[PDB]
Symmetry: C3
Subunit: 266 residues, 3 copies
């Protein structure tokens, strides 16, 4: 099945030609394809950050999409590239190192194969750039309509490496969660606390590390509901609880990092 | 009318997936469309900077263009999104907060509507991301050929919020103007002084704040007319007067900011 | 001959609209064209860096590609823009200041013309932006199928300015070379030492400036062959010798710059 829309993510940056050579390879194999960047500014080697960036990609993108993604410090070793068809019908290609975990939570694997066949690769294969020669090349082949079965042998979806993600839970108070990611352009803090856990309960937010700092925060539908510069709690596009300042940068005011505990209570 | 070329600007950056999810929504509604980024690195919340970046966009881009732009700290409140047809025939979609002001100076609004109809939106609409769910979604619908009248009710062009812009004027000497923007890649300074005001009159340039600094500058057609490192005055692509150093960075040598007065005389 | 794929490089950055106005001009002249960025974050005025970024572009990109590239501090002077057909069949447009040197090493010029004819330019031509009004505009015309002979007069390939590049040589030991570029996203160091010179000979690497620092390094096929954080020598995608740390940044650990000598011996 043709998938004329390739969505492309990596940790190689857009500041040099590296990412564009990959596209060069892709347009060569799939001249009908539209290539769109997700981002290339995933922090180096950071599989987790890459995986978070891919989470909402299945839902935002149409079914004829190939998600092409690589953050691959394991390039040129035993850790293989995989190719996947999800429940939506989209195709996904990347290293089997956890990168596709959160994309697959959004729309599970129906079929998966290890990418092993040289006919879907860019020959010769450079040991230090599987991203281009295997991931990108295979992604374009699948876009052009190559059968998923031709890429290599079938594997069970549990052979796909998954990244552990902490779930928010009820304590007495009391909801305990953590900082998942930071919306870097604005400095809004994203937690793992979903809509339904807070639905129960101005609220009290404790950020213990550091430094046992408590804030009394209003819950708003949007930023403009508090005065300029003032803090707020809101639910984001993903149904997760978030912290921000109206027209300012929250983490510059409260240097929280991913992993940090967030407790919210009446 | 089909407008297969969507030109896309925001303040969300390109360092994460946010801007690409918007494109995901757009390719879904308009699979025939070509999406090209203007830039996503408008400083956060900075409507003015966004508006300057859009100025030359009507003229540089063909008539079948939809200009899709959002810098929207007012997302999820009473400040609506608007959709506009200009005199060139282009379509423009963005928040009614001043963002489209300078694009509209270049090619005025012929027709404008508030974007209110749910059928041109991405349901459900997230209060904190009108950019994606209203601005991007509506832009794609108009690209695909949706009638502008279906987006919501007509409004008068004066109901479109405009940003004030200072005009350069003749004093005795003597031309008084100000710093509009900085060409950040190179550090060239852009003023609001047009070709015709200086046509009259090496020249003398005073930058009063700060610190009453006077420079004797040659007027050149281009950078290579003075020695490497030396300062010059020239007219830019926009017919505005500019200050630069040949193969160096002017603002790193003279820390001027937008708003600062520039006086030029014989 | 139609060349529907335009690959675009400059030093104007992607942080503002400048690069996108160029694309605006290109889609206008060539509505069938696909425009893909190589990168716009070439350091300002740095022709050499631009030229290195273009090296692998002929080989990575299909034959129907127009390579459109400008780093042009000589804009609006006697240094002309050139247009070139290479041995692969690709077309290249840029300033005659050395920028196309390394792209042309990969696939030599078969035909070259100075770009002089106003009918392949964007009128009126702004002296300070040949990038947009000549380079971009001509690139789109050639993409759309304009004959290369219509752009201006033919010239001999030796009238194309070439940048000098240092070759690695055998000494006694002993191979002497230098730092060519830094893989900035990761901090891997690229040398000019090819596969065949080291084929002869853990190895000893001396980086004399600075500060006569010697390292005993293993030669590996890829990063994961040494422990996390440890240094390695490997051959890259280009058949050049490279230095890196496994999942870390080499130049942050050893502040080498392009030009620096690298000596490798048993
Ligand atoms: N010095 C280094 N150590 C470990 N991994 C590295 C590396 N340089 C690049 N990569 C990794 O090579 C991949 C291309 Cl296949 C990129 O995604 C990047 O993660
Ligand atoms: N903490 C914050 N305060 C005010 N506005 C914010 C914000 N975070 C994002 N936006 C705004 O949300 C818009 C998407 Cl609709 C973006 O353009 C951005 O301007
Ligand atoms: N202050 C300055 N001095 C010398 N060259 C400059 C400059 N500002 C922009 N350019 C040069 O103008 C070109 C567009 Cl034609 C860009 O590629 C850039 O290299
Ligand atoms: C260091 S990863 C693979 C090397 C490739 N040449 C690149 O530019 O990233
Ligand atoms: C903070 S603005 C709207 C939120 C959206 N999730 C984003 O990535 O920007
Ligand atoms: C300074 S180079 C040519 C000027 C052009 N206006 C630009 O944005 O770069």
């Amino acid at each position: 099945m043709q998938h004329n829309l390739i969505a492309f993510l990596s940790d190689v940056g857009s500041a040099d030609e590296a990412h564009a050579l990959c596209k060069g390879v892709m347009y060569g194999v799939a001249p009908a394809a539209t290539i769109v960047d997700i981002t290339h500014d995933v922090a180096p080697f950071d599989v987790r950050e890459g995986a978070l960036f891919l989470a909402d990609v299945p839902h935002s993108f149409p079914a004829h999409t190939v998600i092409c993604a690589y953050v691959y410090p394991e390039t040129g070793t035993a850790t293989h590239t995989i190719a996947v068809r999800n429940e939506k019908g989209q195709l996904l290609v990347g290293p089997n190192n956890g990168l596709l975990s959160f994309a697959l939570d959004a729309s599970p694997a129906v079929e998966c194969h290890e990418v092993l066949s040289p006919d879907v690769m860019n020959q010769p294969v450079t040991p230090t750039w599987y991203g281009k020669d295997i991931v990108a090349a295979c992604a374009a082949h699948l876009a052009a309509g190559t059968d998923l079965a031709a890429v290599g042998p079938r594997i069970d979806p549990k052979q796909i490496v998954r990244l552990p993600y902490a779930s928010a839970s009820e304590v007495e108070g009391g909801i305990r969660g953590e900082v998942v990611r930071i919306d870097r352009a604005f400095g809004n803090v994203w937690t793992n606390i979903p809509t339904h856990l807070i639905g129960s309960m101005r609220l009290e937010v404790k950020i213990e590390a550091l430094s046992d700092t408590v804030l009394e925060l209003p819950f708003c539908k949007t930023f403009g509901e508090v005065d300029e510069g003032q803090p707020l709690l809101y639910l984001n596009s993903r149904g997760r609880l978030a912290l921000g300042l109206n027209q300012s940068n929250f983490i510059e005011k409260w240097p929280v990092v991913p992993g940090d505990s967030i407790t919210v209570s009446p």
